[PDB]
Design a protein around this ligand. Sequence first.
Ligand SMILES: NC(=O)c1ccc[n+]([C@@H]2O[C@H](COP(=O)([O-])OP(=O)(O)OC[C@H]3O[C@@H](n4cnc5c(N)ncnc54)[C@H](OP(=O)(O)O)[C@@H]3O)[C@@H](O)[C@H]2O)c1
Ligand SMILES: Oc1c(F)c(F)c(-c2c(F)c(F)c(O)c(F)c2F)c(F)c1F
Length: 316
Amino acid sequence: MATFVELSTKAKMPIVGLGTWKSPLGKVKEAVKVAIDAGYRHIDCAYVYQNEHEVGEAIQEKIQEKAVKREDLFIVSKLWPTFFERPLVRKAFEKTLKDLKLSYLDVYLIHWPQGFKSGDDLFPRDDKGNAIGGKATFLDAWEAMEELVDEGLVKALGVSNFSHFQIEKLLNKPGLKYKPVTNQVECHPYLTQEKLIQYCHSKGITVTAYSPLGSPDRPWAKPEDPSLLEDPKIKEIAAKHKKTAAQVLIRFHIQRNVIVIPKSVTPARIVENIQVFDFKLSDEEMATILSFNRNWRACNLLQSSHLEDYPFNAEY
Ligand SMILES: NC(=O)c1ccc[n+]([C@@H]2O[C@H](COP(=O)([O-])OP(=O)(O)OC[C@H]3O[C@@H](n4cnc5c(N)ncnc54)[C@H](OP(=O)(O)O)[C@@H]3O)[C@@H](O)[C@H]2O)c1
Ligand SMILES: Oc1c(F)c(F)c(-c2c(F)c(F)c(O)c(F)c2F)c(F)c1F
């Protein structure tokens, strides 16, 4: 099996999960099926990925075939920032829950802190492709999301792409009902997030590492961009353990008690990515890997950088 990180709610969040961004229809269903078979219990989803209906199919299949029980699955989705207006929070969540064919979510995340123009255009933008903002804020969103927890439709709330300033704004809001259980952010040896992980952990907030393999198929990749999978120094450590680069990149987070959600639709890779509980990176190897920090992001979202709550201006 695979280990977990205990949340502030005492719920157990499986430390490896399956990413689903850009997992195509026609592949994502088989991907979820192979992952469950391979021992994955945590699946990371989102409204904006537009494939929740197929993830839902796969989960239902495995449950009705007795491969797994709902209570042993840990399903996460995210509210997109075109839906921060209160009534849209409900409508957006209802579509996610119905697509996923579930009666509750384990975690529901604010996907990004900056609000976008409210509505069903997911990427409202000007002529240059710059995001158009909305006046509803992540605090408005959180307020409405808290009702879902009151109603037992979501077990816990969290945030994604929040800086420590934005988490402080959240924690320090008077009249807060629920606290975020996780902050899902990009994290890997080129962006080690030392200060942000230290902050979150000090507040009882776990970290979920996204793009842990450096998202090698991001359509905006430039050949001069760094490549973690092909990095000779990462590959050196892999070799030392007779493991793959990807397995080292995943194990890196487990050893920092950080949840990690590599994405694949390739059955061999889905299996490979969870074969990370039979080796250990040594203290010196962990130190070497941490030294690779470049403060480099695969996910800059520069087209939203002019917005008030754009998260990446702050140091952490
Ligand atoms: N909250 C956010 O704003 C946010 C942002 C980014 C990502 N995420 C979440 O985090 C998940 C993971 O991040 P990501 O999808 O950006 O990138 P990633 O997991 O770092 O990398 C995925 C890419 O690596 C390939 N791959 C997977 N396993 C491999 C292996 N063992 N060896 C070689 N290549 C491998 C995949 O190919 P194949 O699929 O073709 O096998 C895919 O092209 C996302 O899917 C999403 O769930 C969240
Ligand atoms: O959940 C997300 C995701 F998985 C992404 F890859 C992106 C994403 C991103 F943050 C970026 F910065 C990109 O340049 C990109 F192409 C993306 F797909 C994103 F915005 C998300 F909200």
